[PDB]
Amino acid sequence: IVGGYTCGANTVPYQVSLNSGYHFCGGSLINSQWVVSAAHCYKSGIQVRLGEDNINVVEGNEQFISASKSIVHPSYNSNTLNNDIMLIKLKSAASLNSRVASISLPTSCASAGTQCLISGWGNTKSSGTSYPDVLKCLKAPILSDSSCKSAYPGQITSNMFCAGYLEGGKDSCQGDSGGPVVCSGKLQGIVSWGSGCAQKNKPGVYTKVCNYVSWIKQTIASN
Template identity: 70%
Template sequence: MHMRETNGFTLKKGRSAPLVLHPPDALIAVPFDDDDKIVGGYTCEENSLPYQVSLNSGSHFCSGSLINEQWVLSAAHCYETHIQVRLGEHNIKVLEGNEQFINAAKIIRHPYNRDTPDNDIMLIKLSSPAVINARVSTISLPTAPPAAGTECLISGWGNTLSFGADYPDELKCLDAPVLTQAECKASYPGKITNSMFCVGFLEGGKDSCQRDSGGPVVCNGQLQGVVSWGYGCALKNRPGVYTKVYNYVDWIKDTIAANS
């Protein structure tokens, strides 16, 4: 679930094998983090997360969250010129009858630095409003920043292995706590900005991973995080790093208002 790997870190976006891009552009078959799936999680109850969407460009490559009937929030590193948003999904390889496939009309990245990667957040305007029902509905934006120790739910169709690759067809879930900012910064010295936070387990074993990127971190019913990056997946002292949605609520509201 992270855009895990660029300049030594892994972006959790990805379409295929567990390949991590390193500075000399060498590809190696070890943990990568750029759109991963959940490691150490469980299969979500079908259609229990109606805000979860799959971003598709020939195949699933990232996730996002429906924040109103015509707008999806995702990660900037998930940008593609043509995106089909797939709502109401559980098994992304099977047509189950609840899906809505809607093309993106506008894709708006926050001014974003892929090298840091700060401001990893993006809005997608749907070409037509989603039909809201029991299997497709919105998630609330945060009214306060995420508090350390809060239990959150992370979800996605990303890689389920720390080493190697195994991409699930069914949506995976992981319950994990928000870490303190001190723990987060100690895990990634010099890399964590005020617009990032860590969720997970310092002992490793549970994390988001490739192809989870852009997906939701929901705490107490509010969308607190967007899957962004990390070093590998589920490694000791390398928790997942997430975009802090609270810092961007004004940008989100202003951008939607300006593009309605």
């Protein structure tokens, strides 16, 4: 997250870190056994880390649970990142508590202009590299479809939305991929892609989770 703030330990209790020997992507806990992330975060051998603040210190509220299964969307296209969503099943249910908690899936799609909370352990520099140890947060508004298509001509599908600031300076970034975009208390986006981070006229692009609720529900009813 570039231009964000330190969230505060466990104030984003549905945020997970995906670890393959190191943090590589975020995700969102949607119930005690399942995490939503981006399909471009797929790796074999994923451990889900819940209850994290500092990803480099064991502070006492973590649960580390191996994934048993990962399910990339059946229509994921890694070239265009259309349908950039994945489900990850935990080998054992998380113990839900004040610091490890699920986020609701949406009933309705979020509105343009809504300010959402985006979080993660990704790079904090627009130019260069610096990865934080503690979770960062950003409030960013959803942009209109026509603004998002003007920013990325011939690249935005109906399963993507843009959020952020066209002036630059505030965005999600590498290492935040797969993490949540929460709007009015529901998981509405997944950190997916963008041209650089926090560059002028190049806002973040996010997977539109409200288009996938039927898939998520039928997949979790079957696995």
